[PDB]
């Protein structure tokens, strides 16, 4: 939970620096899609943007190579990104695919919690 | 609830005066797009616009800029916005980002009623 | 139900000549562009459409134009459009916005299986 | 169930060779325009598509020529395309659309397990 | 429930008359519901004359569930109350059969959808 | 329940007072519901003044569900409980009239909506 | 349920045989409905050869979930029925092993996966 | 639940320890579960040495829930369960304070958010 994460570090609301977005389901095209477009459209970027796959069932060469392309758009605008949530089956197609290379293997956290914890700590040391 | 204003004042639609819309959940992106361009495609537009906020969990820089384009597109055409039910993190957000300045801090309500009441009564001193 | 006056009328599957469409719920915006979209860009349009109403629970100015756009393209391609399942709320407001004149009084329908029945049988009369 | 039948191949994820979409509802015009449009979008396109029509509960002539145009653009990518779910109604109308002649009438299975075993065993005689 | 809203419209009525009742049986495992209202069947003054009991939401059935809808369709008929059964899907529908439930209510007593049912337990009360 | 967020601050409140309690009956079978609810007002110590039933997730009623209300209504009027109902459909409330269940709360206890029966119910709390 | 529609035609079957029961205890406080199935077990006339618990909705266990799943369990054997369970998360897996429930069943009945278990239910009652 | 499978890794585990138990009041009519599980807890032969009791999912309490709500943590008390309350909403915990609850169950047990009270019972089971 954000509220608790928050918390602990002693803030209330999402930090300026730090993006959050949820992949829809298994056919998360249409929304990565605007997404990716509003991402290049505003005027500031976040530092961090925490991907959260917990609600994609399974990825297939569609899905990969459109969150690949997503990814890159994100990386081009200098953001770090995080993922986290993908269950044991779409953890292992990331490897496969070569997306947890592409973020770094670092950045890749099992549960929501894990990738905002860190997020926030890697904020706060600046 | 829409019903219950409605009839304390002596209604039982919506005045054409009056439009309201509801923020999807925290990724409004697409729906707040197509609203957009809705607004700014039509011949006649309300007098003012109520914007509920009571399904929006968080709001991040991405959501934020967002809010804010949409809002100054509104204000453009002669739309008076006001906005309901933002949770008391989104509430601190709006604040901290300039939003409620934006709008007016007269034109923030906590909860719906608040700014259906509100509109129903700014319409009608008319 | 779609199953039992299909069978009153003899027929398992929608006839060629009858279409079904459900207004989303109160911002059928988005899905309402498509579908007017995929009208105007198919080969071969029905002959009846019957735009359902029953998810709608209130309707301002912009979905008001939205809806009246929406008719007119389908009308100018030769479809013939009924109504079903406003509410009462919604029922009076399409009085007030011109929409029931637009359509046609005996062609708005207070549920869908009458508007069902109608489309069938004005069909067969052919 | 997907992880059963992989597991029954030895597998713990989707080959590369293989892909899955889901109608979302009787309207999937938005939807499957976009997968139409990533389809043709991305480098490398799947040998098989599975297309689930379980959430679908009737078609017209809009969602028939819809998804005859949709089947087309795969096919034209070199994509064999497989359809799965119909229910009773449905599957009539894909017949009486000519639908199961362009697919082929043996790439039509009444159960996703029936045509994602299928897709498996062919990928794999290879 | 607009298609109970509109077979009453066409009987010349806006709610369910008091001779009719309907039940719904949710999900594969009503026992708990099957049994409150059996309860409650067996505790009011006044019953219905016809009861419908809606089987769209049951996907599959066991012989648990045969059972208990048996024990449930027989308290009712004890009450004097004829039970229509509605919205058996295909393979719910052969069960049924097989299992002697449609011998137990009346073969013109199951119907496939429960418009069907409405439609001909309103026209029974008219004649009545 | 914004809506009762904003009636509580309208009287000057943050929460519900110890005075009032709210039900709402969830779909047509609410029998199961109704009797552990039923149970709960016998077994407390402690009663409320005043029960909002709401009747908005309630599409329809028979027979059954009728006298399962009659009945939940005397149990709750007999420990000196006054109850309003609010937001029966317009089926519903026409139901509610032929049976006898207005007549049971009373005319003035009936409310087309949530809202003006917590508000009346809140203005009737302020004056004892 | 379509992964049991395939399964039966797999086997020849349009319906679940009379001989296999299907339960499935939904989200974490499943106690009222194990309570309900366990008394519909010992009330019926005629019981099943084989009961599928499927513990996908499951998300988490703790001591009294497995106390209650444990004596679930139990009245089912005493009355012959032989029990199977799919679908336990990864951590609810650990647990069953941990508490003794995969020794009450026997290891060779717990399946990671609903098709699994009723695939071998199906053969198991061909045999017999 | 994430939130679960975050601290039992902060703590080395992967399942939820024997020693503590988690339920949730679900919706403001909790009366029905809270009753249920209420017997579990004084049906069952080991308990746990703490319950989490999550309120996340109640969005208001009248004098109904609140007697029925002390009725319980008294119940889980006699048998010596440490009970934590998590996640009430700003309202109800306002209810909690003026009604006594927190009073029954202390200050330092009542959570803002579940999260917390999972890390102070691992910390708490740990320790002994």
Redesign the interface.
Known sequence: ????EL?QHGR???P?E?????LEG??F???A???ER??GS?????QILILRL?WV??????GI??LEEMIQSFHKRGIKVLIS?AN??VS??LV?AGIVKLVGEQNVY?????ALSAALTEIEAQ
């Open positions: 939970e954000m509220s608790y918390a209330s609301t999402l300026r730090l993006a959050v977005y949820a298994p056919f095209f249409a929304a899609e605007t997404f509003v991402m505003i005027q500031e970027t976040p917990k069932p399974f990825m297939d060469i569609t190579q459109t949530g044991s089956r292992q197609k496969k099992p549960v929501f919690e894990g």
